[PDB]
Design an enzyme around this catalytic site. Structure first.
Site, PDB file in Angstrom:
ATOM      1  N   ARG A 285       0.561  -1.441   0.027  1.00 40.57           N
ATOM      2  CA  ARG A 285      -0.089  -0.141   0.135  1.00 40.57           C
ATOM      3  C   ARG A 285       0.772   1.182  -0.231  1.00 40.57           C
ATOM      4  NH1 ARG A 285      -2.686   2.472   4.934  1.00 40.57           N
ATOM      5  NH2 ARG A 285      -4.281   3.875   3.904  1.00 40.57           N
TER       6      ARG A 285
ATOM      7  N   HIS B 104      -6.950  -6.287  -1.749  1.00 40.48           N
ATOM      8  CA  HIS B 104      -7.563  -5.971  -0.333  1.00 40.48           C
ATOM      9  C   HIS B 104      -7.422  -7.416   0.360  1.00 40.48           C
ATOM     10  CE1 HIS B 104      -8.982  -1.691  -0.168  1.00 40.48           C
ATOM     11  NE2 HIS B 104      -7.788  -1.688  -0.083  1.00 40.48           N
TER      12      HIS B 104
ATOM     13  N   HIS C 176      -0.340   4.295  -2.382  1.00 42.31           N
ATOM     14  CA  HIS C 176      -0.473   5.718  -1.928  1.00 42.31           C
ATOM     15  C   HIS C 176       0.632   6.472  -2.872  1.00 42.31           C
ATOM     16  CE1 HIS C 176      -3.830   5.622   1.092  1.00 42.31           C
ATOM     17  NE2 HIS C 176      -3.931   4.561   0.096  1.00 42.31           N
TER      18      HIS C 176
ATOM     19  N   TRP D 268      -9.794  -8.360   5.592  1.00 37.69           N
ATOM     20  CA  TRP D 268     -10.663  -8.790   4.451  1.00 37.69           C
ATOM     21  C   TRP D 268     -10.778 -10.047   4.433  1.00 37.69           C
ATOM     22  CZ3 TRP D 268      -7.494  -4.595   4.100  1.00 37.69           C
ATOM     23  CH2 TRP D 268      -8.092  -3.334   3.761  1.00 37.69           C
TER      24      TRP D 268
END
Ligand code: HEM
Ligand code: HEM
Lengths: 294, 104
Positions: free
Chosen positions: A48, A175, A52, A191
């Site tokens: 991530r 995810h 980002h 998740w």
């Protein structure tokens, strides 16, 4: 208006052989430090940061992105949207110190490639050449998405980064990894079940569980399974739309496809805004630890 | 070290495949009760692989300590798709927790 161009440039005299080293270093630490976030390890957070940094792009004026590697500066760094990522950054740093010549940007995106590949996920081609840009190139906080909207908002969000429905759905399958932290995003819960192994569980969890809307201590609502998984409002859209839905089922069913679509889109993600010359090296396909028998 | 910390290890990297208590149904993996001081392909009710039963060895501390580095390495052609834990501390911490959990 009429945009800026960013042309890749290999870190002076760096080969494919220097890169794998940056790679390895990260893979080896990933294994050292696997204690972080209850034995999840830093993988997920790395998939991530990757995003980002990349996710601030705007095809309109060709600003933001992975190129200038501005995350290293207080405005981006402190975007409330980036909460959580400082952990993956401090994990990267010592590595950055061993290989001083790598751009923050190549470090950041390589960071994500390493993690994916090390979590039993698909190989991802990568291109060195991002060059660190002056502090005044850091976009304003807030080009990242909210997790409270609908298929609507999600389709539209990805249009600012030339992503189509097949490509946003395929990235979203990332995810399966990590989880949400009440303390950083105002969400709590994973998740699925293997959250440090790269697979398509997302899609089946979506398709098979008994989602139930509940509200949290942050006072956001989120879908909760009685299996101990969650699904952001926005991960829920993928099934609340027939187009996205069609794709979810397709990936729920065939992982080798899911996987094929992700390397593609992920690298597209990492490459928006970068101009790759002629007198440019093709994407590298680094070798995992497991193949070097390390 | 801890069963405490050893516990976390288990939920996280293996509970997706095994029960530890006697009368723990076997999911993709056998129940793990009756581990310490037992042979391979030992669990009554599981569709082991020749390769497994036949490793023919006692399931003991250090034995695990090895195994846990490289399940594949230590036993060719198996179904347990885990890449081993490579560290010793956490291999040690999981081994603790087990002695408990897998018997009493
Ligand atoms: C539809 C757009 C997206 C939204 C609204 C969204 C939102 C979020 C939020 C709120 C969290 C949890 C923050 C925390 O509690 O640490 C999270 C975690 C995560 N996101 Fe997404 N995200 C999106 C797209 C993506 C994409 C495109 C990727 C991958 C390429 C991705 C990969 C991840 C991963 C792996 C985690 C786990 C982080 C961790 O465990 O530290 N997400 N996302
Ligand atoms: C990470 C912690 C784990 C521990 C301590 C562990 C322990 C073991 C041990 C000791 C055996 C051999 C049983 C015997 O012969 O007496 C075994 C077999 C097996 N385990 Fe695991 N396991 C773990 C994780 C996993 C995971 C994550 C999976 C995922 C599928 C899994 C699936 C299996 C399978 C399929 C077998 C049977 C191999 C065969 O006979 O073909 N295990 N496990």
């Amino acid at each position: 208006t009429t945009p800026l161009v960013h042309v890749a440039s290999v870190e002076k005299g760096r080969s494919y052989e220097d890169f794998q080293k940056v790679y390895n270093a990260i893979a080896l630490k990933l294994r050292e430090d696997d204690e972080y976030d209850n034995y999840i390890g830093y993988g997920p957070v790395l998939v991530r940061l990757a995003w980002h940094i990349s996710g601030t792009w705007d095809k309109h004026d060709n600003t933001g992105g992975s190129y200038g590697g501005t995350y290293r500066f207080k405005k981006e760094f402190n975007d409330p949207s980036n909460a959580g990522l400082q952990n993956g950054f401090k994990f990267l740093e010592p590595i950055h110190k061993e290989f001083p010549w790598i751009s923050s940007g190549d470090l950041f995106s390589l960071g994500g490639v390493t993690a994916v590949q090390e979590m039993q996920g698909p190989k991802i081609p990568w291109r060195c050449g991002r060059v660190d840009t002056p502090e005044d190139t850091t976009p304003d906080n807030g080009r990242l998405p909210d997790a409270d909207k609908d298929a609507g908002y999600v389709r539209t969000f990805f249009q600012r980064l030339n992503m189509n429905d097949r490509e946003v759905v395929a990235l979203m399958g990332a995810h399966a990894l990590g989880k949400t932290h009440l303390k950083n995003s105002g969400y709590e819960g994973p998740w699925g079940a293997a959250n440090n192994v790269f697979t398509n569980e997302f899609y089946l969890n979506l398709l098979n569980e008994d989602w139930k809307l509940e509200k949290n201590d942050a006072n956001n609502e989120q879908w909760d399974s009685k299996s101990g998984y969650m699904m952001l409002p926005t991960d829920y859209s993928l099934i609340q739309d027939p187009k996205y839905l069609s794709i979810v089922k397709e990936y729920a069913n065939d992982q080798d496809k899911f996987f094929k679509d992700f390397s593609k889109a992920f690298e597209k993600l990492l490459e928006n805004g970068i101009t790759f010359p002629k007198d440019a090296p093709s994407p590298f396909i680094f070798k995992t630890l497991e193949e070097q028998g390390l | 070290g801890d069963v405490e910390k050893g516990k976390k290890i288990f939920v996280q990297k293996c509970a997706q495949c095994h029960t530890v208590e006697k009368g723990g149904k076997h999911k993709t993996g056998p129940n793990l009760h009756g581990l310490f001081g037992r042979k391979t392909g030992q669990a009554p009710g599981f569709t082991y692989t020749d390769a497994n039963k036949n490793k023919g060895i006692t399931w003991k501390e250090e034995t695990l300590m090895e195994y846990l580095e490289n399940p594949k390495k230590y036993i060719p052609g198996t179904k347990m798709i885990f890449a081993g834990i490579k560290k010793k501390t956490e291999r040690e911490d999981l081994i603790a927790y087990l002695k408990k959990a897998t018997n009493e």
